[PDB]
């Protein structure tokens, strides 16, 4: 009569193999051809990619590994690559019932028309299966009923057809008791203006109950230059606290008033992340920070930061479904979060996100080893 015990989560979007959505420019660059040198950039990362996030498929595989049950909603073709992906997910035990297969479209491929009329112009003739799903039948109402969290990323807002479907799905979940999680993960086209982006993402933000944004994303949305100027303020004559006497990295806590431009009534929680180093949380009644660490140099020749963001979002979802007092008690939330930081640390120690996403036992052991007994 009731549903199975660990509550279910739904991940909606496109299944892509190892795709990093966020791209901006970096001042430091290495040799064009020798790839044995590129590891150095992983050791000292460009900031936007301290904990790179990824495709919606990856979050599901991690949730299952950390304990938990997940389902993936999307369309893949009946081609060979498509079948490989479903096999991987099925093998990892992610529910694949809501995946639709199409015979007229091919996975990973988009047809474009390149036209030069004094400018390089590309226009889209046909779209990828992943980016073409429809409300009508692609939506399994059964999965939507059991689910207690719906997870989407911002890529869906870059295609007209999936945008329409996302909104039908959000509505149906709320009817059946669901809570929506928007993990932003901004794509390259959406890093051009604060103004164009705020408008494109607006409807989604307001229909969201839990939101995760990176430090670089939050500043992009609000006063990016103002924050940059602040971090380069060095006092002229005397320091005002003994902290400024010590030359250490900035970890500013954004005051609740600053984030007011972006709050809405149905927002239970907001998380801002700075790699695995800091995680800031904001709630209708309380605010704060959880301290963390990162050691990619313990294994210098097998370090990749590619799925670390997916892992932090997964640990959060796992603890939130199981522990319900996180929403109202500050201490519980903090203690619980330290588990998510741990998942991220372990995901930076292997090449490839799917290889090396951590298991629950391993994550508890690292929490216990890294933190003092009282904190844990």
């Amino acid at each position: 009569f009731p549903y199975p015990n660990p509550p279910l989560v739904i991940c909606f979007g496109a299944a892509q193999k190892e795709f990093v959505p966020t791209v901006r420019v970096s001042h430091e660059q290495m040799h064009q051809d020798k790839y044995s040198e590129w590891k150095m950039l992983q050791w000292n990362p460009p900031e936007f990619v301290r904990a790179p996030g990824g495709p919606p498929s990856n979050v599901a595989i991690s949730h299952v590994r950390l304990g938990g049950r997940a389902a993936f909603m999307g369309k893949v073709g009946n081609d060979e690559f498509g079948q490989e992906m479903v096999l991987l997910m099925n093998k990892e035990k992610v529910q694949t019932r809501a995946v639709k297969f199409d015979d007229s479209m091919r996975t990973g491929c988009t047809h474009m028309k390149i036209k030069f009329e004094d400018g390089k112009m590309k226009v889209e003739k046909v779209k990828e299966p992943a980016e073409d799903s429809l409300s009508s039948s692609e939506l399994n109402l059964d999965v939507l009923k059991e689910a207690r969290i719906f997870h989407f990323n911002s890529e869906v807002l870059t295609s007209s057809s999936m945008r329409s479907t996302l909104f039908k799905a959000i509505s149906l979940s709320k009817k059946f008791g669901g809570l929506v999680f928007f993990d932003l993960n901004l794509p390259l086209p959406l890093w051009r203006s604060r103004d164009e982006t705020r408008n494109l993402i607006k409807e989604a933000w307001e229909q969201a109950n839990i939101i995760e944004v990176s430090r670089q994303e939050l500043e992009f949305l609000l006063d990016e230059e103002h924050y940059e100027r602040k971090r380069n303020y060095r006092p002229q004559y005397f320091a005002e606290n003994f902290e400024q006497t010590k030359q250490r990295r900035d970890y500013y806590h954004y005051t609740p008033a600053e984030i007011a431009p972006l709050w809405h009534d149905g927002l239970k929680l907001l998380f801002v992340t700075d790699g695995t180093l800091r995680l800031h949380y904001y709630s209708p009644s309380f605010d704060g920070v959880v301290v963390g660490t990162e050691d990619v140099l313990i294994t210098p020749f097998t370090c990749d930061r590619t799925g670390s963001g997916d892992a932090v979002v997964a640990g959060i979802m796992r603890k939130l479904t199981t522990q319900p007092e996180m929403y109202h008690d500050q201490d519980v939330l903090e203690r619980q979060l330290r588990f998510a930081i741990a998942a991220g640390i372990i995901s930076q120690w292997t090449i490839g996100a799917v290889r090396g996403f951590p298991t629950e036992s391993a994550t508890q052991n690292l929490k216990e080893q890294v933190y003092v007994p009282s904190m844990w």
Binding site: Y3, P4, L87, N90, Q95, T96, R97, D142
Partner: peptide, 23 residues
């Protein structure tokens, strides 16, 4: 052993039965 690679998710089955088998 193609059967080994066919999973129940693909053969449409009603929910109550699916949840039970997976249990």
């Amino acid at each position: 052993i193609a059967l080994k690679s066919i999973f129940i998710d693909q053969s449409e089955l009603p929910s109550r039965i699916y949840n039970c088998l997976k249990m």
